[PDB]
């Protein structure tokens, strides 16, 4: 059916360039314009630009006019096609999520779209992160702080401990890098008897720490 | 060109309504957090398909209203309309509950990260309706106003609430000098703010 597959996250430095794609499969793919979206965390869609199937032809907002190139490649039987969006000379602003999307009548309804692929910009390097405890019906958690990039997962007690539990979204700080928290809430009497470890993974850079609290 | 308000409340069974100011060929879009836009209603008023009966639009002259009639759990999301390259803010929809007060905890920062040269000291607000809510930082009832951050969850598929956690960060230096610290939060549900203090 009529799909469209985008490709994973991508980190970059400032100043560099970041390619994009997109796979588009199963319909007509000669007779519909793709376009281009983006979104930054807590923010709007903006149009990044379109391209046509048949000529190759882009065009783009102002706002990305020269720095970014929309390309494309057909397969030979035109049953898929690769579509890229190329940005170079990143800059902070340029951190978000890029959705490519098909066009299906003349006047820009979009019925399809891929799922997104994220663009961190960001100075900084791979790093797991350090987890400290929250310590204390009562509260307690773990501090799950400065990793890179994202994401990470948080368990307790290897996933037997689930009902309670609030992992927050992930902010980033002045220096570069990723905090969050993940807390859970316990009956005040339960904590003699019972044991509470936050589990966490963060596999790029394969750290994965369990932490008694 | 713009659309109101920028939150609503319903409960589920309920109708709701969200308004664009925008001209021309108009399409509406339901965006689930961190998830693509859907198409529900394009130029105007022809509902997409595969998208439930119970959305509807209308081109009330200027401007475009999107309905949905007996809201369900699953239209909790938010709505924009989009007009060519032209995108509206858009429109957080969440479920009406009771309004609950908010469960709020202190965290001190760790010694064992104090050994690393960063302090942090966490606030926790717990379980909490409406979405809305402010948190301040007092300490020595010195007011701090730079050096902090908060985090938001999504409201709760479960109960319906909120939680918050707001984190400030020190050195280790500054953290030592003051001793007593405290987090103050108002909310919707509290006649009066309350503090947790360490
Ligand atoms: C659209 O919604 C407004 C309120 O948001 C309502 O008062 C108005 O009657 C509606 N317009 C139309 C086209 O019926």
């Known amino acids: 059916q009529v799909h469209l597959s985008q490709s994973g996250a991508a980190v970059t430095k400032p100043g560099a360039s970041v390619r994009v794609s997109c796979e588009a499969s199963?319909?007509?793919?000669?007779?519909?314009?793709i376009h281009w979206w983006r979104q930054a965390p807590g923010q709007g869609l903006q149009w990044v630009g379109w391209?046509?199937?048949?000529?190759?032809?882009?065009?783009?907002?102002?706002q990305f006019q020269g720095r970014v190139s929309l390309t494309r490649q057909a397969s030979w039987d035109f049953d898929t096609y690769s579509f890229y969006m190329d940005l170079k000379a990143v800059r902070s602003d340029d951190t978000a999520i890029y959705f490519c999307?098909?066009?299906?009548?003349?006047?820009?309804?979009?019925?399809?779209w891929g799922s997104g692929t994220q663009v961190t910009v960001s100075s900084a390097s791979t790093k797991g992160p350090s987890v400290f405890p929250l310590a204390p019906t009562a509260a307690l958690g773990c501090l799950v702080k400065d990793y890179f990039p994202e994401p990470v997962t948080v368990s307790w007690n290897s996933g037997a401990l689930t009902s309670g539990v609030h992992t927050f979204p992930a902010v980033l700080q002045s220096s570069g890098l990723y905090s969050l928290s993940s807390v859970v809430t316990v009956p005040s009497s339960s904590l003699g008897t019972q044991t509470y470890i936050c589990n966490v993974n963060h596999k790029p850079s394969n750290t994965k720490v369990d932490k008694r609290v | 060109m713009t659309q109101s308000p920028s939150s609503l409340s319903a409960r589920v069974g309920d109708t709701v309504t969200i308004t664009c100011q925008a001209n021309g060929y108009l399409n509406w879009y339901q965006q689930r957090r961190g998830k693509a836009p859907k198409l529900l209603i394009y130029d105007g008023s022809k509902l997409e398909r595969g998208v439930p009966a119970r959305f509807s639009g209308r081109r009330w002259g200027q401007e475009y209203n999107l309905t949905i009639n007996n809201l369900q759990p699953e239209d909790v999301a938010t709505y924009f309309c989009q007009v060519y390259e032209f995108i509206v803010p858009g429109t957080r929809l969440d479920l009406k509950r009771t309004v609950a007060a908010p469960s709020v905890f202190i965290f001190p920062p760790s010694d064992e990260q104090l050994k690393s040269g960063t302090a942090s000291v966490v606030c926790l607000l717990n379980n909490f309706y409406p979405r809305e809510a402010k948190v301040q930082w007092k300490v020595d009832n010195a007011l701090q106003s730079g050096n902090s951050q908060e985090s938001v969850t999504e409201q709760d598929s479960k109960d319906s609430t909120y939680s918050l956690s707001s984190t400030l960060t020190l050195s280790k230096a500054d953290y030592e000098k003051h001793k007593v610290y405290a987090c103050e939060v108002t909310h919707q549900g509290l006649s009066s703010p309350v503090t947790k203090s360490f």
């Open positions: 999307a098909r066009q299906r009548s003349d006047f820009w309804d979009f019925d399809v």
């Open positions: 199963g319909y007509k793919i000669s007779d519909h314009f």
């Open positions: 391209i046509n199937p048949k000529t190759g032809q882009p065009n783009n907002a102002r």
